[PDB]
Amino acid sequence: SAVGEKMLDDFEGVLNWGSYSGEGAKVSTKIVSGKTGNGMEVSYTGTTDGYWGTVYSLPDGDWSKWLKISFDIKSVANEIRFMIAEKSINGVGDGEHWVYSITPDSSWKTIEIPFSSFRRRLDYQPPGQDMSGTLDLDNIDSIHFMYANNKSGKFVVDNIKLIGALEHHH
Numbered sequence: 001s002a003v004g005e006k007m008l009d010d011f012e013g014v015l016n017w018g019s020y021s022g023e024g025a026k027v028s029t030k031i032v033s034g035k036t037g038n039g040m041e042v043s044y045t046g047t048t049d050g051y052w053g054t055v056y057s058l059p060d061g062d063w064s065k066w067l068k069i070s071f072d073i074k075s076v077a078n079e080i081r082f083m084i085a086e087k088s089i090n091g092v093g094d095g096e097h098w099v100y101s102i103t104p105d106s107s108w109k110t111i112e113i114p115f116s117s118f119r120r121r122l123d124y125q126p127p128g129q130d131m132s133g134t135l136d137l138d139n140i141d142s143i144h145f146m147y148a149n150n151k152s153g154k155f156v157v158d159n160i161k162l163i164g165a166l167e168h169h170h
């Protein structure tokens with residue numbers, strides 16, 4: 001593993017995130033004040049069968065040198081999911097979905113999730129999933145902030161970054 005970190009989005013540069021929804025649910029995103037400088041506000045309304053999410057599709061899918069994914073989050077409290085999708089076995093589209101549930105609170109908090117802590121999604125898997133039961137870090141398609149339930153809410157994210165190994169002195 002590599003040491004240190006690699007920033008994916010501090011929201012001070014170009015706009016990278018797209019929105020998607022279906023089956024009654026709705027989502028919208030905008031640039032607002034973040035932890036430092038800019039951040040992205042995600043506003044969602046859920047339905048029983050509805051899905052929503054915001055997605056950054058990655059140009060380079062090889063994350064095999066990294067160990068964790070980190071982000072700052074704050075509510076504007078409803079549970080949501082951070083999701084990592086592998087690349088499809090058919091070449092185009094999303095593959096195996098891997099999830100971690102998080103609940104944004106009133107104050108800014110840093111959430112660091114090791115890749116080994118992600119769980120294989122069971123409510124949905126896309127047709128291009130590899131069914132391997134292992135999160136293949138060398139084959140990453142995209143990252144998502146997405147629905148976990150049928151409820152509504154608003155949150156802000158900032159400082160999305162990869163974390164490698166720490167330099168332990170003892």
Ligand SMILES: [Ca+2]
Nearest residue numbers: 010034036038
């Ligand atoms: Ca920022």
Ligand SMILES: [Ca+2]
Nearest residue numbers: 096132134136
């Ligand atoms: Ca897999």
